[PDB]
Amino acid sequence: GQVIARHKVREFNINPVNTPTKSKLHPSVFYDVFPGDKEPAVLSDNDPRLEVKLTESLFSKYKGNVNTEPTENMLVAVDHYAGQLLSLDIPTSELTLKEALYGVDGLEPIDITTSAGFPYVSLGIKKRDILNKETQDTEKMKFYLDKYGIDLPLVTYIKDELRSVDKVRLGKSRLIEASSLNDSVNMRMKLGNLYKAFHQNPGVLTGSAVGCDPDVFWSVIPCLMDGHLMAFDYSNFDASLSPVWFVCLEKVLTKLGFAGSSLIQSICNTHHIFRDEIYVVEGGMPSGCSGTSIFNSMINNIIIRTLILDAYKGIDLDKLKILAYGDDLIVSYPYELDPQVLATLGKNYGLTITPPDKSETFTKMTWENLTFLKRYFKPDQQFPFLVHPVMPMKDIHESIRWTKDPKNTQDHVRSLCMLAWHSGEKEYNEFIQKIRTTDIGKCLILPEYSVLRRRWLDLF
Ligand SMILES: [Sm+3]
Hints:
Elements: E1 2-7, H1 9-12, E2 26-27, E3 39-40, H2 54-60, H3 72-87, H4 97-102, H5 127-130, H6 139-148, E4 154-158, E5 162-163, H7 165-169, E6 175-178, H8 181-187, H9 192-200, H10 214-217, H11 221-224, E7 230-234, H12 243-256, H13 263-268, E8 269-273, E9 278-282, H14 292-311, E10 321-325, E11 328-332, H15 339-346, E12 353-354, E13 376-379, E14 387-390, H16 393-400, E15 402-403, H17 409-420, H18 425-435, H19 439-443, H20 449-458
Parallel strand pairs: 4-8
Antiparallel strand pairs: 1-9, 2-15, 3-5, 4-6, 7-11, 7-12, 8-9, 10-11, 13-14
Helix pairs in contact: 3-12, 3-14, 12-14, 14-15, 16-17
The site of samarium (III) ion (SM) has 3 residues, from loops.
């Protein structure tokens, strides 16, 4: 994706947005007791630890844009991937303003904590005013739908979160390019069954993990990926998606039977409202559109299928098994294919594909080394057929040392226990013991290890 043009909001007569220009992240009491580097992201041009122009930094992610019509290999991959997806028998029927608004079984009511987006953000009017959860009202939406229409621009906040020392100074703090409520209900109303299917079918058929409890799903990935092993992750996946991949994503939904795949063009080329200065981009996935997670996965399934055909000759795609959660990949084939080969090959579609999280360089992948959703795979001692998701203790330490509002310093610490304990009894007791060094640490009521193991076992 490349930025084709920049204008001022004045030119379009649009009220600018005062982007939250201060981090709400402060150091928690566990800042001294645990180790970590990561500090909060840069949200302002002045921010003293910044060694670079922020304007340029925030948008450097848009490296360029490769222009082709879909390759022959590309085209095979969409017919094969779409093929698998037909077997699921996904309804092509569209959803209702009421369904799309407040969920069905499969979907979850649009979050009334996220931004409504343009133009609502600049009218002070937020999600609650339109959305009555108890009533399940459709008058306020239908009104503001008829009024402002669809295909509205995107409000581009800059995301407030922990970043590594490098991504702090180099101004890499990434963006959420948030969608208008109009647009998110619109295509949530006609690809609602596409999302429904992916949420109910996390696996090797959808090539998807989006919406899955790793607690249980971890202990089933190894049954599904029965073959050799590869894993990947990209740097700036979203921004790097040249339009071609979108023309494939559409082509897939078209074969699936969704009139509405036209929407996909509407996310490829988009307008973004950053501070005032409104950008317009060709390509790139909006990080925080409606089906971002799902569309990425689908495209990733298109991409590795393509790269592997590009790279190799005599290959049956039916035995190629894939599992993507956005940029995160796991893939398996009966024969040992070379990750490195693939990564290079994809670099001529504009992609920077890379070894999975916590991996220095492409070696043969093994269940001992693998990462997915930032977690290791550690099979249980007593019952080796059950598999633990092990979020590394560094990542958990790095999270506990900061806090937004130290009232929910419990809710946050408890949540970290549900992840920590998978590391094993020895480490979990060291963890809560160190937490309980601090004075507010001891007042927190924490689950004991045997409690957490039992809750986990009961899930089966
Ligand atoms: Sm990733």
